[PDB]
Swiss-Prot record, chains A, B:
Keywords from the named record: Methyltransferase, S-adenosyl-L-methionine, Transferase
GO molecular-function terms, A-Z: diphthine synthase activity
EC number: 2.1.1.98
Role summary: S-adenosyl-L-methionine-dependent methyltransferase that catalyzes the trimethylation of the amino group of the modified target histidine residue in translation elongation factor 2 (EF-2), to form an intermediate called diphthine. The three successive methylation reactions represent the second step of diphthamide biosynthesis.
Reactions it catalyzes: 2-[(3S)-amino-3-carboxypropyl]-L-histidyl-[translation elongation factor 2] + 3 S-adenosyl-L-methionine = diphthine-[translation elongation factor 2] + 3 S-adenosyl-L-homocysteine + 3 H(+)
Additional notes on this entry: The diphthine intermediate is not stable in vitro and readily eliminates the trimethylamino group. It is not known whether the elimination reaction also occurs physiologically.
Quaternary assembly: Homodimer.
Binding site for S-adenosyl-L-methionine: L10, D87, V90, S115, I116, L166, A209, H234
Name this polypeptide is given: Diphthine synthase
Pathway participation: Protein modification; peptidyl-diphthamide biosynthesis
SUPFAM superfamilies: Tetrapyrrole methylase
Family: Belongs to the diphthine synthase family.
Amino acid sequence: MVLYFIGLGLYDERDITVKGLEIAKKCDYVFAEFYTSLMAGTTLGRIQKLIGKEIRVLSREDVELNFENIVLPLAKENDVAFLTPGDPLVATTHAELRIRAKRAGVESYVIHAPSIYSAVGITGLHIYKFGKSATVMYPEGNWFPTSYYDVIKENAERGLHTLLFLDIKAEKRMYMTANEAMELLLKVEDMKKGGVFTDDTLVVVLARAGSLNPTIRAGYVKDLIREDFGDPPHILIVPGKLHIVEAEYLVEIAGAPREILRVNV
Amino acid sequence: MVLYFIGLGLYDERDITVKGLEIAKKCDYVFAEFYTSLMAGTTLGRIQKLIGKEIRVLSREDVELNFENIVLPLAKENDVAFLTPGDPLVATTHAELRIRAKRAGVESYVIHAPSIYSAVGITGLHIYKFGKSATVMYPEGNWFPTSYYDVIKENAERGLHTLLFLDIKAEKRMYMTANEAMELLLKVEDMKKGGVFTDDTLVVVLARAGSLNPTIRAGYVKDLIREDFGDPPHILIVPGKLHIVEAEYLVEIAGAPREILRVNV
Ligand SMILES: Nc1ncnc2c1ncn2[C@@H]1O[C@H](CSCC[C@H](N)C(=O)O)[C@@H](O)[C@H]1O
């Protein structure tokens, strides 16, 4: 008896690691959640087909409130897996579920899978130069979140890049676009006026990482804010000071304006 | 006419994704490099047997000096794969290779795989709280580099965690251990007196991420500096102030002392 947290990867069902597939195939019960991220290139059926097991999908409430009532009981008598998009423990609160497993006497194992957190490397930006990350959250009611704006400011002060995860309302099938996140940011800048995010800010958009042809675009907010980046999911990145080879790659691979080649050192 | 950058993942031959494996099997020629890092849980023979293709290994000079003369020519009239440990393009210099492909008129696609950059999610530390990353380098001769110490200081200053890659002599298969990294940083502390890394600093050690049995340990330097964390590779993390949920994961899963619950939160 054991519980496995198995990541499914960035885009489709083949983004699972071979390790994860052969372990998932021999589990007695398989559960999964698809609310922490969007795998735009597959379906439940295709995943079930690949793993050869029926998958029961859990909602945020089933997990956050009933994980120990729905999943853990089986794991005491059987080999159980819990599948998630990307890497199970990245920008989720799933790590705490391991604590629940322990206090229920269930041993758990983690099988990693490609994550958007490291897949940003395809933007050409040096991974080590990424600072603190943040999430753009949809304003709801009279509440307008803005903390992600300060993260950008503090990273950019240090010359660090900022990775911006975008909001998701899976049960409403709403996936925030980079365009939406740019609009939100311009609005917070008119409030705070820190010169952090303007029409002239260089940004990078990565859409559907993991697919064979993801959309990778770099340019000024004024030029990109109304551009079509294709289907979700999307992440937005606000680079800090660029190394020359970073700029080179943004121009050659992501279609950035030639002039960012001229780095002001 | 196509070059595929395929990641092999964290630890053994099963850490490659299903997508990467299937694509590698259909490639006419398969290259790989093991200088940016090593796949400590497997061998080149086991990877070859899994892919069912002979793998020509390239040195760092083969790649950096002659990538366009060794790999790209074949990719003009064949499907070629270039394998690398972890996630492709996380290593600083690899992105550039895609520009070389473009220049040579060769199509390139990136197949992602788990990277230690994202796998540290398994320490229970929130991914978004990681700041700039650094590598602890072995000093030698009259050269004692210490920038990695500076990186810790300005992340922790901002309440951020610091991911520290450890030095490696890929070709001699010599891995720097977390213990050596800790002693070094105490050495740098004695040099710089910044109050950044001392006996009382809380650290996290992650060894053999990707394995089903990785070592995850958290505690104060005075206690962990001579502890055996098992076979390489080792990764060292100097956490910033912890969220209570991070601290209880470290206590419950990483064997951290209860003391962190009131000293580091
Ligand atoms: N393939 C992909 N392409 C672009 N953005 C992606 C993505 N997968 C995830 N994201 C981003 O991350 C958000 C979910 S955050 C959860 C991330 C997941 N554990 C992982 O390891 O990737 C999405 O709303 C989106 O902004």
